[PDB]
C-alpha cells in the first residue's frame, strides 16, 4: 500500500484503517487495486497526510436526498463482490432523477478536520446520464473563506483495471468554527466523514530496506 491508497480505502489496504506512524515507509512494490484515479497536487495531499501522521477516521452522516448511496464497481472488488474506496461514498440517481445536493457539516470540535472527496469522470455521455441524469455534473465543496468547484469531464482514458473512466480526488480542510458545505448536481464522490489532523514529528519515506528489531 501507498499512503494515499491507505487514506482512500482501497480494499487491499483496509488493514491500514485508523493507523498511526512517526514514519510511513512506502515500498516500490506497492500497487493500486481499485477504481483508477488521480490526485491533482498528489504531492501535497501525500505530504500533509504523512505529516499529520495519523489515518484516524471519524464518521459523519451527511443528509443526502433522493440519491442512491454506496455505488461500487467490479474494478474495485471487496471480497467476492463489487466494491469501492472504503472512505468514499459514490452517489448516483434514484429512478429518473438526481436532485441537486446541498449539505452542511459544521466543525464544532477542538481540532481541524481533513475531508477527502472526489469527482467522477465518465467515459461516455451515456454513462454520465445513466448515473447522474443531467448531462453535465458539477461539484462545489466550500468553507467560509475558501471554495472549490470541479466540473467533471466526459471522455476516454487509457484502459485501467477495466475502466476508461476516472475519479479525481480533492481535499478540503475545515478549521474549528468553520463550516463545510457540499453542493452537487451529480458526479460527486462524497466523503463519509473526516480524518483527524495532528501536528508532530511524523513523515514518510520511500525505501525497500527491510525493517528489523
Amino acid at each position, epitope marked *: 500500500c501507498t499512503l494515499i491508497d491507505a487514506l482512500l480505502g482501497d480494499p487491499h489496504c483496509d488493514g491500514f484503517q485508523n493507523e498511526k506512524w512517526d514514519l510511513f515507509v512506502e515500498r516500490s512494490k506497492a500497487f493500486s487495486n481499485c477504481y483508477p484515479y488521480d490526485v491533482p497536487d498528489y504531492a501535497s495531499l501525500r505530504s500533509l497526510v504523512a505529516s499529520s501522521g495519523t489515518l484516524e477516521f471519524i464518521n459523519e452522516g451527511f443528509n443526502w436526498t433522493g440519491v442512491t448511496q454506496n455505488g461500487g464497481s467490479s474494478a474495485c472488488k471487496r471480497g467476492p463482490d463489487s466494491g469501492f474506496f472504503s472512505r468514499l461514498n459514490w452517489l*448516483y440517481k434514484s*429512478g429518473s432523477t438526481y436532485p441537486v445536493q446541498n449539505v452542511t457539516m459544521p466543525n464544532n470540535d477542538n481540532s481541524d478536520k481533513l475531508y477527502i472527496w472526489g469527482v467522477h469522470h465518465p*467515459s461516455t455521455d*451515456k*454513462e454520465q*446520464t445513466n448515473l447522474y441524469v443531467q448531462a453535465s455534473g458539477k461539484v462545489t465543496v466550500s468553507t467560509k473563506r475558501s471554495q472549490q468547484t470541479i466540473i467533471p469531464n466526459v471522455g476516454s482514458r487509457p484502459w485501467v483495471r477495466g475502466l476508461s473512466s476516472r475519479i479525481s480526488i480533492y481535499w478540503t480542510i475545515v478549521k474549528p468554527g468553520d463550516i463545510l458545505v457540499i453542493n452537487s448536481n451529480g458526479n460527486l464522490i462524497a466523503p463519509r466523514g473526516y480524518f483527524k489532523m495532528r501536528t508532530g514529528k511524523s513523515s514518510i519515506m520511500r525505501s525497500d530496506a527491510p525493517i528489523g528489531t
Partner: antibody
Amino acid sequence: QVQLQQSGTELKKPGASVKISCKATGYTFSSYWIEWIKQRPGHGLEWIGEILPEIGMTNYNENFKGKATFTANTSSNTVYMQLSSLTSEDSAVYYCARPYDYSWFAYWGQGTLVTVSA
Amino acid sequence: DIVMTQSQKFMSTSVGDRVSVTCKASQNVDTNVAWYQEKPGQSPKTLIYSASNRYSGVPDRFTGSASGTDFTLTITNVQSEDLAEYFCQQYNSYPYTFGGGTKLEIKR
C-alpha cells in the same frame, strides 16, 4: 433490432442456486442499464434490481439483498443474475429489461421460468 | 417504498366501447409512470410513458392521463386483440414498484 435473449427454463432442488443469463444484441451493450423483474402467479410484478454493465455497478431492491446477484460479461455482451438459497417462494418467471435510456422500460426479454421443488 | 395501487383486478367492457384503468401512487411520483400490456403467454409490451405519452408503434386508442397521484390508462374503441393484463409502473424513485395488474374482460 434490439433483442434481449434469456436462458432456458430451469428446475432446481430447494437450497441450490441458479444463474439466469440475458444476452443483449442490437445496441451498444454498455450504454444502458439491465433490469431484472420477478413474476409469481399471484404476486404480479416485483422489481429485483438493475446493473450497469461497464462498471459493474449493481443496485438491488432492499427486499432481494442477499437473494440475488447480478454480473456482466462485457465481451459476451451478457448480463447474469444469480439466485441463491432457493425456496419455493423463488419459483416464478424472471424477466430482464432494458430502459429506453435511463429510466422507464422499453425492451423486455422473453422470460425465464424457474421452478423449485424436491 | 412507493405503492402503486390498481384497485380493479378485472374490468368489463364491450368491443368498440371505451375503458379506463386507474392506478394510484401512494405518494408523489410526479408524471413518471409507465403503462405496460401483458398478453397471455407473451412478454410485457410497452404502452405509455411520462404518464401521457404514446410509445412508438402503439395505436392511438391507448391514451394515458395523470392528475396528481391519480394515473389513468384509457382505451377507446376496444378491439378483441386488446384482451390482456395491464400493469402500471412508477419509475420515479428506487425501488421501482408496480401495480397489481388489471385484467381486461369482454362481454359479447
